[PDB]
Amino acid sequence: ATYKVKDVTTGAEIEVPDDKYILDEFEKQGVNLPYSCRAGACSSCVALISSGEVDQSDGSFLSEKQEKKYILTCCSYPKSDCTIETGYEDKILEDFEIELAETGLEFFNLPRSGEILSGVTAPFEAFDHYLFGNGVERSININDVGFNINVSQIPPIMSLLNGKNVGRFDIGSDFVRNTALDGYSVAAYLGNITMRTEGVLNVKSDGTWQYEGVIRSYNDTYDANPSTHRGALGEWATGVLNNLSGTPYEIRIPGELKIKENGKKL
Ligand code: FES
Ligand SMILES: [Cl-]
């Protein structure tokens, strides 16, 4: 039989006999491709295979898991129509990194889009999205993050409560939230964010006070590259980033958190 082998890199579509190697037949039709050994023992001729199947049993360089994703074009016979991407030598991954992507898809899943699942997996999902999400925006409602914000932690409010100010004050101010205050799980994907509180603070002459309002969040940019933030990644995440490049992305945090507190200054 013969099969059609479409190559996304060059655009060529070549009929390749099931008893001829893909490289040789593309060359025969005038499409020059990369190679070195031509003997199955290197990655010069490697191509991504996105659809179809080959017999590349003549080659030796790729692992069993790598052969699910890539082909050595010098020693591959097509067994069905195929879609490949030549010149992929610069982009092939080793087993531990192919399986990291697969696992994340299956564990968290359109995939790697929209809402982030609330709870203990959030910083894991966020890191996986950094690695494999290609910069697509994600979201989590402010009420699903697990913020634990109190007035003592909001300097625009405390500035009025700490001075001798009596009356009714309309507060509308941004402030930086170090989400370490909200727990390691949140800090591990949000870090420092900018938030906004809007509300009313009422302070009596005797020091009794009440605050009522809302808190909203501006969008945050997720970027795990260590030079862009405060946190230790740890040895495992450092390792992953020594082998894969991620893509920053925006996290949209919509909604209002209600805040209502009261006290008495002495
Ligand atoms: S050119 Fe070395 S494996 Fe194909
Ligand atoms: Cl004062």
Author numbering: 2 to 110, 116 to 272
Task: Please quote the authors directly.
Pectocin M1 and M2 consist of an M-class cytotoxic domain with lipid II degrading activity, fused to a plant-like ferredoxin domain (Grinter et al., 2012a; 2013,). This ferredoxin domain, which contains an intact [2Fe-2S] iron–sulphur cluster, substitutes for the helical receptor binding domain and IUTD of the M-class bacteriocins discussed above, that are required to deliver the cytotoxic domain to the periplasm. We have previously demonstrated that Pectobacterium spp. are able to acquire iron directly from plant ferredoxin under iron-limiting conditions through a receptor mediated process and that the bacteriocins pectocin M1 and M2 parasitize this system for cell entry through presentation of a ferredoxin domain (Grinter et al., 2013). The lack of an IUTD indicates that the ferredoxin-containing pectocins utilize an existing ferredoxin uptake mechanism to cross the OM, without direct interaction with the Tol or Ton complexes in the periplasm.
The bimodal distribution of the selected ensembles suggests discrete populations in solution, the more compact of which is similar to the conformation observed in the P21 crystals of pectocin M2. In an attempt to capture the more elongated conformation in crystallo, thus validating our solution scattering and modelling data, we repeated crystallization of pectocin M2. A form with the radically different space group of P3121 was chosen for optimization, which yielded crystals diffracting to 1.86 Å. As an alternative domain arrangement to the P21 form was expected, data from this crystal form were again phased using anomalous data from the metal centres of the [2Fe-2S] cluster. During model building from these data it was immediately apparent that in this crystal form pectocin M2 did indeed adopt an elongated conformation. The calculated Rg and Dmax for this structure were 28 and 97 Å respectively. These values correlate well with the extended population from the DMD simulation, suggesting that this structure is representative of the second elongated pool indentified by our modelling. Alignment of this elongated (P3121) form and the original P21 form, based on their cytotoxic or ferredoxin domains, show a major difference in the relative orientations of these domains. As the elongated conformation of pectocin M2 has comparable dimensions along its length we manually docked this model into the barrel domain of the hemophore receptor HasR, a TonB-dependent receptor shown to be responsible for importation of the relatively bulky substrate, haem. This docking illustrates that pectocin M2 in its elongated conformation could traverse the lumen of such a receptor to gain entry to the cell, with the flexibility of pectocin M2 observed in solution allowing the protein to adapt to the shape of the lumen of its transporter during importation.
